[PDB]
């Protein structure tokens, strides 16, 4: 849900695209700068990024991933090493997804 508040401006037909960040026709101006949004975001580490580059979120949010899960998965012991009171038990790792 935060991840939606770019602030890119509307350039004007027929302009150059501009990179420093003194104008206010620059996302991470101050004026263009709204608190809890995107800008703020990227402005708390005084870092530089044009319109297209912030513009690129939206076919970026095509692909998504739905939330992180704990996944515990186990097997017999290997081969070499696999007798009949061995296989009994069993080894218990687990990781996460996402």
């Known amino acids: 849900p935060a991840l939606q508040a770019v602030i890119v401006p509307e350039i004007p037909a027929d302009e150059e695209a501009p990179t420093t960040p003194e104008d206010p026709r620059h996302p991470l101006h101050a004026h263009q700068l709204v608190p809890n949004s ?3 975001y990227f402005h708390n580490a005084h870092l530089t990024v044009d319109g297209d580059a912030l513009l690129t979120l939206q076919e970026l949010m095509g692909d998504m991933a739905e939330r992180t899960t704990a996944i515990l998965v186990s097997s017999a012991p290997d081969a ?11 080894i218990y790792d687990g990781a996460l997804y996402h």
């Open 38 to 40: 995107l800008n703020v």
């Open 80 to 90: 070499g090493a696999a007798t009949a009171t061995t296989r009994n038990m069993r």
